[PDB]
């Protein structure tokens, strides 16, 4: 079973957790608890650029978030049916990662500029990203973003919808098709199980855990 | 010809220019010069996220650097022969992308950062790739066949040279890869004068990237 090496938090590993679970793939997690736990992965030659996330899958040690996701998405037929579909998927998920990244780094952001950063994110969500995705759905009227078949684009998008909801549950209000997508995807057997309590889904970064991050890393 | 929409500068479109030319594909560039030119692309509905780079290729309008490079890489078989090779390729180029993003944003805490980038190149990135080349002793990074990994790395080797030519001294293999790749007919052509390759961003286009954006 795929072994995911990361600390006990969402961070850069959460999208992978969401994708595997959505693919109905059982995985393992080897939690880094200290800076010393990390140094060993390094000295043990497990980390190409001395960083995590690192995932042990099918005989090799993959680092770099996108390498991990691209591999899993292709293996479990969640990367579309051809080069053109992947292009759409890629364009969609890179837009999702751009927003996800901003949200992911808000708590690491220096205090004095946290307010401006959060306002900037909410503006982009309402005027740039949510409309872009709502439009995709309204254009073709299908249940999924691409090829009228479940793909990583739908998984990454809905995962983000949950983070936007925690940030401000009003942002998605004027985007019915998105709201509807979140519901459909959330009720797919695998995703519904991942969303249930006790699953490996991680909580939003709190405090004790951010302090542990700057400590380990 | 694929149509590249960006402003006359390297920025986020340079890696694409290198890839297309490496694949021997001729392209056209529609240079954005003003803030209005950028607004016209938006109003015409050509930018999914209101951003560039954006490339028109095979009938689609693709934005997002990685979406563009990924498509081009696969189309011209520069993305490995299978899923496992693509993973190695992706792992390699993403490390490259990380080091590039650092340099790409440097001009936009100056000293402290520069000294950090150099240390990472010397102690983290170059050793990682040097190690790769030594592990199999082949002319290319993956599957002993040219791939986007060779092109992006070599492109980066050039940028690192412009920054400090001494940084690649303790890495003989990276040095060698750079010479073989630069000698490939297509890459050599892109390296000679008059090619679409863009110059380092000086004071100007930095203010033009400021004005246009
Ligand atoms: N492009 C790479 C980046 C990999 C990377 O940055 N790895 C970090 C760890 S990523 C997890 C830690 N981190 C980044 C700073 Cl360390 C981080 C963790 C959690 C958050 C979340 C903050 C709260 C929130 O999510 O809102 C943000 C950053 C690492 O190993 N650093 C050590 C080193 O470089 O020497 C990839 O995507 O794999
Ligand atoms: N994830 C996307 C991001 C695309 C993106 O950032 N596009 C920018 C333009 S990227 C080119 C400009 N730029 C980034 C700030 Cl705008 C930039 C340009 C040149 C340099 C290089 C400086 C010199 C050096 O390389 O050292 C750095 C940044 C854009 O169109 N913004 C408009 C908006 O958001 O409303 C992608 O990778 O395609």
mmCIF file of N, CA and C and ligand atoms in Angstrom, chain A residues 66 94-95 98 124 128, chain B residues 6-7 9-12 38 42 47 49-53 63-66 68 100 102-108 200-202 205-206 209 213, ligand 2:
data_model
loop_
_atom_site.group_PDB
_atom_site.id
_atom_site.type_symbol
_atom_site.label_atom_id
_atom_site.label_comp_id
_atom_site.label_asym_id
_atom_site.label_seq_id
_atom_site.Cartn_x
_atom_site.Cartn_y
_atom_site.Cartn_z
ATOM 1 N N UNK A 66 3.200 17.553 -7.239
ATOM 2 C CA UNK A 66 2.655 17.336 -8.565
ATOM 3 C C UNK A 66 3.058 16.018 -9.191
ATOM 4 N N UNK A 94 -4.565 23.567 -12.179
ATOM 5 C CA UNK A 94 -3.481 24.488 -11.872
ATOM 6 C C UNK A 94 -4.094 25.796 -11.366
ATOM 7 N N UNK A 95 -5.321 26.079 -11.801
ATOM 8 C CA UNK A 95 -6.006 27.270 -11.328
ATOM 9 C C UNK A 95 -6.407 27.022 -9.881
ATOM 10 N N UNK A 98 -3.399 27.288 -7.621
ATOM 11 C CA UNK A 98 -3.008 28.678 -7.397
ATOM 12 C C UNK A 98 -3.762 29.274 -6.213
ATOM 13 N N UNK A 124 -10.506 37.185 -5.224
ATOM 14 C CA UNK A 124 -10.190 36.293 -6.329
ATOM 15 C C UNK A 124 -11.162 35.118 -6.417
ATOM 16 N N UNK A 128 -12.727 35.776 -9.737
ATOM 17 C CA UNK A 128 -11.898 35.044 -10.683
ATOM 18 C C UNK A 128 -12.059 33.524 -10.765
ATOM 19 N N UNK B 6 2.110 36.627 -24.492
ATOM 20 C CA UNK B 6 2.830 37.062 -23.307
ATOM 21 C C UNK B 6 3.458 38.398 -23.657
ATOM 22 N N UNK B 7 4.266 38.947 -22.758
ATOM 23 C CA UNK B 7 4.918 40.196 -23.098
ATOM 24 C C UNK B 7 6.345 39.845 -23.499
ATOM 25 N N UNK B 9 9.393 39.153 -22.980
ATOM 26 C CA UNK B 9 10.324 38.870 -21.893
ATOM 27 C C UNK B 9 10.267 37.385 -21.565
ATOM 28 N N UNK B 10 11.223 36.909 -20.778
ATOM 29 C CA UNK B 10 11.237 35.501 -20.407
ATOM 30 C C UNK B 10 10.023 35.187 -19.545
ATOM 31 N N UNK B 11 10.048 35.660 -18.305
ATOM 32 C CA UNK B 11 8.935 35.412 -17.405
ATOM 33 C C UNK B 11 8.516 33.955 -17.393
ATOM 34 N N UNK B 12 7.219 33.733 -17.236
ATOM 35 C CA UNK B 12 6.683 32.383 -17.174
ATOM 36 C C UNK B 12 6.523 31.686 -18.518
ATOM 37 N N UNK B 38 -3.666 43.420 -22.504
ATOM 38 C CA UNK B 38 -4.004 42.330 -21.588
ATOM 39 C C UNK B 38 -5.510 42.302 -21.332
ATOM 40 N N UNK B 42 -8.627 39.382 -22.016
ATOM 41 C CA UNK B 42 -9.617 39.039 -21.008
ATOM 42 C C UNK B 42 -11.027 39.241 -21.555
ATOM 43 N N UNK B 47 -8.706 34.120 -21.673
ATOM 44 C CA UNK B 47 -7.954 33.724 -20.480
ATOM 45 C C UNK B 47 -8.870 33.179 -19.382
ATOM 46 N N UNK B 49 -8.447 32.283 -16.417
ATOM 47 C CA UNK B 49 -8.259 32.884 -15.098
ATOM 48 C C UNK B 49 -7.789 34.334 -15.206
ATOM 49 N N UNK B 50 -8.008 34.936 -16.375
ATOM 50 C CA UNK B 50 -7.628 36.327 -16.642
ATOM 51 C C UNK B 50 -6.116 36.540 -16.592
ATOM 52 N N UNK B 51 -5.370 35.465 -16.817
ATOM 53 C CA UNK B 51 -3.917 35.530 -16.780
ATOM 54 C C UNK B 51 -3.256 34.949 -18.023
ATOM 55 N N UNK B 52 -1.993 35.310 -18.199
ATOM 56 C CA UNK B 52 -1.163 34.754 -19.247
ATOM 57 C C UNK B 52 -0.014 34.179 -18.393
ATOM 58 N N UNK B 53 0.846 33.331 -18.966
ATOM 59 C CA UNK B 53 0.835 32.864 -20.349
ATOM 60 C C UNK B 53 -0.412 32.142 -20.834
ATOM 61 N N UNK B 63 -4.217 28.112 -20.846
ATOM 62 C CA UNK B 63 -3.520 28.972 -19.908
ATOM 63 C C UNK B 63 -2.913 28.045 -18.846
ATOM 64 N N UNK B 64 -2.096 28.606 -17.956
ATOM 65 C CA UNK B 64 -1.405 27.883 -16.880
ATOM 66 C C UNK B 64 -0.169 27.188 -17.431
ATOM 67 N N UNK B 65 0.996 27.693 -17.050
ATOM 68 C CA UNK B 65 2.262 27.152 -17.512
ATOM 69 C C UNK B 65 2.323 25.623 -17.638
ATOM 70 N N UNK B 66 2.055 24.929 -16.539
ATOM 71 C CA UNK B 66 2.140 23.470 -16.517
ATOM 72 C C UNK B 66 1.204 22.753 -17.473
ATOM 73 N N UNK B 68 0.257 23.917 -20.351
ATOM 74 C CA UNK B 68 0.875 24.146 -21.652
ATOM 75 C C UNK B 68 2.079 23.227 -21.867
ATOM 76 N N UNK B 100 13.640 27.562 -9.971
ATOM 77 C CA UNK B 100 13.428 28.600 -10.960
ATOM 78 C C UNK B 100 12.517 29.682 -10.415
ATOM 79 N N UNK B 102 12.272 30.665 -7.493
ATOM 80 C CA UNK B 102 13.081 31.456 -6.560
ATOM 81 C C UNK B 102 13.870 32.531 -7.300
ATOM 82 N N UNK B 103 14.499 32.142 -8.402
ATOM 83 C CA UNK B 103 15.271 33.077 -9.197
ATOM 84 C C UNK B 103 14.319 34.026 -9.940
ATOM 85 N N UNK B 104 13.267 33.466 -10.533
ATOM 86 C CA UNK B 104 12.270 34.242 -11.280
ATOM 87 C C UNK B 104 11.622 35.376 -10.484
ATOM 88 N N UNK B 105 11.583 35.246 -9.163
ATOM 89 C CA UNK B 105 10.952 36.267 -8.332
ATOM 90 C C UNK B 105 11.928 37.143 -7.554
ATOM 91 N N UNK B 106 13.202 36.771 -7.582
ATOM 92 C CA UNK B 106 14.256 37.498 -6.877
ATOM 93 C C UNK B 106 14.182 39.033 -6.994
ATOM 94 N N UNK B 107 14.072 39.570 -8.222
ATOM 95 C CA UNK B 107 13.997 41.020 -8.439
ATOM 96 C C UNK B 107 12.733 41.678 -7.881
ATOM 97 N N UNK B 108 11.637 40.924 -7.847
ATOM 98 C CA UNK B 108 10.374 41.438 -7.321
ATOM 99 C C UNK B 108 10.263 41.177 -5.820
ATOM 100 N N UNK B 200 17.881 38.319 -20.380
ATOM 101 C CA UNK B 200 17.589 38.472 -18.953
ATOM 102 C C UNK B 200 16.733 39.712 -18.768
ATOM 103 N N UNK B 201 15.885 39.700 -17.748
ATOM 104 C CA UNK B 201 15.022 40.831 -17.497
ATOM 105 C C UNK B 201 15.783 41.925 -16.820
ATOM 106 N N UNK B 202 15.925 43.001 -17.568
ATOM 107 C CA UNK B 202 16.637 44.135 -17.040
ATOM 108 C C UNK B 202 15.686 45.046 -16.299
ATOM 109 N N UNK B 205 11.706 46.006 -18.995
ATOM 110 C CA UNK B 205 10.559 45.079 -18.999
ATOM 111 C C UNK B 205 10.094 44.745 -17.592
ATOM 112 N N UNK B 206 10.906 45.001 -16.573
ATOM 113 C CA UNK B 206 10.477 44.760 -15.179
ATOM 114 C C UNK B 206 9.430 45.825 -14.878
ATOM 115 N N UNK B 209 6.503 44.963 -17.079
ATOM 116 C CA UNK B 209 5.743 43.842 -16.541
ATOM 117 C C UNK B 209 4.878 44.443 -15.445
ATOM 118 N N UNK B 213 0.946 44.590 -16.419
ATOM 119 C CA UNK B 213 0.142 43.854 -15.452
ATOM 120 C C UNK B 213 -0.513 44.783 -14.447
HETATM 121 N N1 LIG C 2 -0.018 29.704 -12.143
HETATM 122 C C1 LIG C 2 -0.064 30.564 -13.337
HETATM 123 C C2 LIG C 2 0.302 31.994 -12.935
HETATM 124 C C3 LIG C 2 0.228 32.944 -14.133
HETATM 125 C C4 LIG C 2 0.530 34.381 -13.707
HETATM 126 O O1 LIG C 2 1.021 34.625 -12.605
HETATM 127 N N2 LIG C 2 0.221 35.315 -14.601
HETATM 128 C C5 LIG C 2 0.446 36.744 -14.336
HETATM 129 C C6 LIG C 2 1.632 37.237 -15.166
HETATM 130 S S1 LIG C 2 3.175 36.290 -14.902
HETATM 131 C C7 LIG C 2 4.335 37.505 -15.623
HETATM 132 C C8 LIG C 2 4.500 38.727 -14.718
HETATM 133 N N3 LIG C 2 5.205 38.324 -13.493
HETATM 134 C C9 LIG C 2 4.456 37.893 -12.300
HETATM 135 C C10 LIG C 2 3.694 39.070 -11.688
HETATM 136 CL CL1 LIG C 2 2.621 39.608 -12.638
HETATM 137 C C11 LIG C 2 6.532 38.311 -13.508
HETATM 138 C C12 LIG C 2 7.193 38.679 -14.676
HETATM 139 C C13 LIG C 2 8.576 38.582 -14.758
HETATM 140 C C14 LIG C 2 9.301 38.115 -13.668
HETATM 141 C C15 LIG C 2 10.810 37.909 -13.811
HETATM 142 C C16 LIG C 2 11.606 39.033 -13.144
HETATM 143 C C17 LIG C 2 13.096 38.912 -13.479
HETATM 144 C C18 LIG C 2 13.679 37.569 -13.031
HETATM 145 O O2 LIG C 2 13.301 36.548 -13.645
HETATM 146 O O3 LIG C 2 14.503 37.595 -12.091
HETATM 147 C C19 LIG C 2 8.644 37.762 -12.492
HETATM 148 C C20 LIG C 2 7.262 37.860 -12.411
HETATM 149 C C21 LIG C 2 -0.792 37.544 -14.741
HETATM 150 O O4 LIG C 2 -1.215 37.510 -15.896
HETATM 151 N N4 LIG C 2 -1.338 38.276 -13.775
HETATM 152 C C22 LIG C 2 -2.534 39.100 -14.007
HETATM 153 C C23 LIG C 2 -3.511 38.928 -12.842
HETATM 154 O O5 LIG C 2 -3.241 38.041 -12.002
HETATM 155 O O6 LIG C 2 -4.506 39.685 -12.823
HETATM 156 C C24 LIG C 2 0.913 30.052 -14.397
HETATM 157 O O7 LIG C 2 1.991 29.562 -13.995
HETATM 158 O O8 LIG C 2 0.565 30.167 -15.591
#
